[PDB]
Design an enzyme around this catalytic site. Structure first.
Site, PDB file in Angstrom:
ATOM      1  N   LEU A  44     -24.939 -50.511   8.085  1.00 21.21           N
ATOM      2  CA  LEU A  44     -26.076 -50.439   9.011  1.00 21.21           C
ATOM      3  C   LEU A  44     -26.848 -49.116   8.872  1.00 21.21           C
ATOM      4  O   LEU A  44     -27.951 -48.991   9.400  1.00 21.21           O
ATOM      5  CB  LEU A  44     -25.615 -50.596  10.464  1.00 21.21           C
ATOM      6  CG  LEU A  44     -24.928 -51.893  10.843  1.00 21.21           C
ATOM      7  CD1 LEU A  44     -24.454 -51.833  12.270  1.00 21.21           C
ATOM      8  CD2 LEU A  44     -25.854 -53.069  10.667  1.00 21.21           C
ATOM      9  N   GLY A  45     -26.241 -48.140   8.195  1.00 23.90           N
ATOM     10  CA  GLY A  45     -26.832 -46.826   7.994  1.00 23.90           C
ATOM     11  C   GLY A  45     -25.850 -45.767   7.547  1.00 23.90           C
ATOM     12  O   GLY A  45     -24.650 -46.031   7.405  1.00 23.90           O
ATOM     13  N   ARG A  46     -26.373 -44.553   7.295  1.00 24.46           N
ATOM     14  CA  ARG A  46     -25.596 -43.406   6.840  1.00 24.46           C
ATOM     15  C   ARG A  46     -26.134 -42.121   7.469  1.00 24.46           C
ATOM     16  O   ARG A  46     -27.343 -41.863   7.433  1.00 24.46           O
ATOM     17  CB  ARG A  46     -25.609 -43.313   5.304  1.00 24.46           C
ATOM     18  CG  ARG A  46     -24.531 -42.398   4.729  1.00 24.46           C
ATOM     19  CD  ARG A  46     -24.349 -42.624   3.242  1.00 24.46           C
ATOM     20  NE  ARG A  46     -23.351 -41.720   2.665  1.00 24.46           N
ATOM     21  CZ  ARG A  46     -22.917 -41.782   1.408  1.00 24.46           C
ATOM     22  NH1 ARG A  46     -23.379 -42.714   0.582  1.00 24.46           N
ATOM     23  NH2 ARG A  46     -22.006 -40.920   0.971  1.00 24.46           N
ATOM     24  N   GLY A  47     -25.224 -41.365   8.076  1.00 22.12           N
ATOM     25  CA  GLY A  47     -25.472 -40.070   8.701  1.00 22.12           C
ATOM     26  C   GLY A  47     -24.882 -38.962   7.848  1.00 22.12           C
ATOM     27  O   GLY A  47     -24.377 -39.232   6.754  1.00 22.12           O
ATOM     28  N   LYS A  48     -24.939 -37.704   8.337  1.00 25.70           N
ATOM     29  CA  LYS A  48     -24.429 -36.537   7.598  1.00 25.70           C
ATOM     30  C   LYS A  48     -22.940 -36.659   7.271  1.00 25.70           C
ATOM     31  O   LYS A  48     -22.558 -36.521   6.106  1.00 25.70           O
ATOM     32  CB  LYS A  48     -24.736 -35.219   8.337  1.00 25.70           C
ATOM     33  CG  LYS A  48     -26.086 -34.619   7.976  1.00 25.70           C
ATOM     34  CD  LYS A  48     -26.303 -33.253   8.601  1.00 25.70           C
ATOM     35  CE  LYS A  48     -27.696 -32.765   8.305  1.00 25.70           C
ATOM     36  NZ  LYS A  48     -28.032 -31.559   9.097  1.00 25.70           N
ATOM     37  N   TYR A  49     -22.112 -36.983   8.288  1.00 26.93           N
ATOM     38  CA  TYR A  49     -20.675 -37.137   8.098  1.00 26.93           C
ATOM     39  C   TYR A  49     -20.131 -38.489   8.634  1.00 26.93           C
ATOM     40  O   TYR A  49     -18.980 -38.556   9.063  1.00 26.93           O
ATOM     41  CB  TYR A  49     -19.929 -35.921   8.689  1.00 26.93           C
ATOM     42  CG  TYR A  49     -20.423 -34.578   8.178  1.00 26.93           C
ATOM     43  CD1 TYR A  49     -20.284 -34.223   6.836  1.00 26.93           C
ATOM     44  CD2 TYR A  49     -21.011 -33.655   9.039  1.00 26.93           C
ATOM     45  CE1 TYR A  49     -20.726 -32.986   6.365  1.00 26.93           C
ATOM     46  CE2 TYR A  49     -21.455 -32.416   8.578  1.00 26.93           C
ATOM     47  CZ  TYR A  49     -21.306 -32.082   7.240  1.00 26.93           C
ATOM     48  OH  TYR A  49     -21.748 -30.862   6.784  1.00 26.93           O
ATOM     49  N   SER A  50     -20.957 -39.567   8.574  1.00 26.44           N
ATOM     50  CA  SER A  50     -20.580 -40.904   9.038  1.00 26.44           C
ATOM     51  C   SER A  50     -21.325 -42.053   8.360  1.00 26.44           C
ATOM     52  O   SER A  50     -22.507 -41.928   8.066  1.00 26.44           O
ATOM     53  CB  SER A  50     -20.749 -41.026  10.551  1.00 26.44           C
ATOM     54  OG  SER A  50     -22.109 -40.901  10.924  1.00 26.44           O
ATOM     55  N   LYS A  67     -17.931 -47.000  13.004  1.00 27.89           N
ATOM     56  CA  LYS A  67     -18.482 -45.755  12.467  1.00 27.89           C
ATOM     57  C   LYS A  67     -17.342 -45.028  11.728  1.00 27.89           C
ATOM     58  O   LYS A  67     -16.419 -44.517  12.355  1.00 27.89           O
ATOM     59  CB  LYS A  67     -19.048 -44.914  13.622  1.00 27.89           C
ATOM     60  CG  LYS A  67     -19.689 -43.564  13.267  1.00 27.89           C
ATOM     61  CD  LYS A  67     -19.841 -42.822  14.589  1.00 27.89           C
ATOM     62  CE  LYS A  67     -20.508 -41.497  14.488  1.00 27.89           C
ATOM     63  NZ  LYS A  67     -21.075 -41.166  15.788  1.00 27.89           N
ATOM     64  N   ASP A 155     -28.674 -34.558  20.872  1.00 28.71           N
ATOM     65  CA  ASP A 155     -29.248 -35.178  19.671  1.00 28.71           C
ATOM     66  C   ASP A 155     -30.093 -36.381  20.047  1.00 28.71           C
ATOM     67  O   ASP A 155     -30.080 -37.420  19.371  1.00 28.71           O
ATOM     68  CB  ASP A 155     -28.204 -35.457  18.579  1.00 28.71           C
ATOM     69  CG  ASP A 155     -28.785 -35.734  17.191  1.00 28.71           C
ATOM     70  OD1 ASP A 155     -29.944 -35.306  16.921  1.00 28.71           O
ATOM     71  OD2 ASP A 155     -28.122 -36.433  16.408  1.00 28.71           O
TER      72      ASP A 155
HETATM   73  C1  LIG Z   1     -29.331 -48.297  12.351  1.00 32.51           C
HETATM   74  S1  LIG Z   1     -29.008 -47.899  14.028  1.00 32.51           S
HETATM   75  O1  LIG Z   1     -27.754 -47.216  14.085  1.00 32.51           O
HETATM   76  O2  LIG Z   1     -29.182 -49.084  14.806  1.00 32.51           O
HETATM   77  N1  LIG Z   1     -30.144 -46.846  14.503  1.00 32.51           N
HETATM   78  C2  LIG Z   1     -31.568 -47.195  14.532  1.00 32.51           C
HETATM   79  C3  LIG Z   1     -32.164 -46.931  15.894  1.00 32.51           C
HETATM   80  C4  LIG Z   1     -33.550 -47.508  16.008  1.00 32.51           C
HETATM   81  N2  LIG Z   1     -34.344 -46.862  17.048  1.00 32.51           N
HETATM   82  C5  LIG Z   1     -35.147 -47.824  17.803  1.00 32.51           C
HETATM   83  C6  LIG Z   1     -36.043 -47.205  18.848  1.00 32.51           C
HETATM   84  C7  LIG Z   1     -35.624 -46.129  19.621  1.00 32.51           C
HETATM   85  C8  LIG Z   1     -36.385 -45.666  20.681  1.00 32.51           C
HETATM   86  C9  LIG Z   1     -37.612 -46.258  20.991  1.00 32.51           C
HETATM   87  C10 LIG Z   1     -38.354 -45.762  22.187  1.00 32.51           C
HETATM   88  C11 LIG Z   1     -38.680 -46.624  23.239  1.00 32.51           C
HETATM   89  C12 LIG Z   1     -39.323 -46.150  24.374  1.00 32.51           C
HETATM   90  C13 LIG Z   1     -39.644 -44.808  24.485  1.00 32.51           C
HETATM   91  C14 LIG Z   1     -39.332 -43.941  23.451  1.00 32.51           C
HETATM   92  C15 LIG Z   1     -38.704 -44.417  22.307  1.00 32.51           C
HETATM   93  C16 LIG Z   1     -38.042 -47.308  20.177  1.00 32.51           C
HETATM   94 CL1  LIG Z   1     -39.613 -48.004  20.396  1.00 32.51          CL
HETATM   95  C17 LIG Z   1     -37.270 -47.783  19.136  1.00 32.51           C
END
Ligand SMILES: CS(=O)(=O)NCCCNCc1ccc(-c2ccccc2)c(Cl)c1
EC number: 2.7.11.1
Length: 326
Positions: A44-50, A67, A155
């Site tokens: 699903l993704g890659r971070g610095k140490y994960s 994770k 963060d």
């Molecule tokens: C691959 S993963 O581990 O799933 N990470 C990936 C995250 C993906 N982020 C999605 C995201 C985060 C925040 C906001 C946001 C909403 C309202 C106000 C401010 C910001 C929006 Cl539109 C989308």
């Protein structure tokens, strides 16, 4: 004299009045599970140490998120595990379900509830003013809660906010940088991601608190309502302060560093310059005017302040007129 001391205006002594078992993560006993209960599906993704993976819990056919942590520093893994356990069940906080180790490679892995994230680069230009108010409030619930538990996330950024738009579900994730707040403690400023770093971090003011997460939240709100990602686009940590100063002005920056007797790094001498304080209306354009309102501008102005003590707390923010419709 050195820098003037500071402390949080809210939840100042929550950890002080609690037993060492709560905040002493180094003494915490971690009990590993059996990774054989989980079958990895996809990355699903890659971070610095994960490395984050979607997985199947084979004992109940349920989807989970795994994770896998590069065990670079044991104390840091213990800190994250403790905080997660401490915050388990809080509103909009990722739920740590299990802690497992690879029987062979011995690598630590954290297992969480699955979140069906909708794409960030798709979840834009369809989102309305109401949706922004709604999700910002869900993030504040997460922040007020973890701050009330004596934890600062450190963060806060769009990559750490997972949204399942179909079910209107939000989860604040990646507590790898999170820390216990203790009044008067001096923290490492090498936290948060560049664009989301608060002025306290960029001027090397170590005695910061929960209010750092409120700056980060402001940066996310500004990028969302103005359709400018990131809002403060620094090319390095020194330049990051300059981008902030181009909006907030250099006058209030000098007021801030004088109030806390902060010594400004010599590297700022030739790059800082002089900048007027800009009006928030300056960022309104045809592409973003449907998302901007006087309430949104008043709220943003109360989060994006140099003075970490003058910023709204998560609870004061939830009471702001910007949220009357939610
Ligand atoms: C691959 S993963 O581990 O799933 N990470 C990936 C995250 C993906 N982020 C999605 C995201 C985060 C925040 C906001 C946001 C909403 C309202 C106000 C401010 C910001 C929006 Cl539109 C989308």
């Amino acid at each position: 004299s050195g820098p003037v001391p500071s402390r949080a205006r809210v939840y100042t002594d929550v950890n002080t009045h609690r037993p060492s078992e709560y905040w002493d993560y180094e003494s915490h006993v971690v009990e590993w599970g059996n990774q054989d209960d989980y079958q990895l599906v996809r990355k699903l993704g890659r971070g610095k140490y994960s490395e984050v993976f979607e997985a199947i819990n084979i004992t109940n056919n349920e989807k989970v998120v795994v994770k896998i942590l590069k065990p670079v520093k044991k104390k840091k893994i213990k800190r994250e595990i403790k905080i997660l356990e401490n915050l388990r069940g809080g509103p909009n906080i990722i739920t740590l379900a299990d802690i497992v180790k690879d029987p062979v490679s011995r690598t630590p892995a954290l297992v969480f509830e699955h979140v069906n994230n909708t794409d960030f680069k798709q979840l834009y230009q369809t989102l309305t003013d109401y949706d922004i108010r709604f999700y910002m409030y869900e993030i504040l619930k997460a922040l007020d809660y973890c701050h009330s538990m004596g934890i600062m996330h450190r963060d806060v950024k769009p990559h750490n906010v997972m949204i399942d738009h179909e079910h209107r579900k939000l989860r604040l994730i990646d507590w790898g940088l999170a820390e216990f707040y203790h009044p008067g403690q001096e923290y490492n400023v090498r936290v948060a991601s560049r664009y989301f770093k608060g002025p306290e971090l960029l001027v090397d003011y170590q005695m910061y608190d929960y209010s750092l997460d409120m700056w980060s939240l402001g940066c996310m709100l500004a990028s969302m309502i103005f359709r400018k990602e990131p809002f403060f686009h620094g090319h390095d940590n020194y330049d990051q302060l300059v981008r902030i100063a181009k909006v907030l002005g250099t006058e209030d920056l000098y007021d801030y560093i004088d109030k806390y007797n902060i010594e400004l790094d010599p590297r700022f001498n030739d790059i800082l310059g002089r900048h007027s304080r800009k009006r928030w209306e300056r960022f309104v354009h045809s592409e973003n005017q449907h998302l901007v309102s006087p309430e949104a501008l008043d709220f943003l102005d109360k989060l994006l302040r140099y003075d970490h003590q003058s910023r709204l707390t998560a609870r004061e923010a939830m009471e702001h007129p910007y949220f009357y419709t939610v």
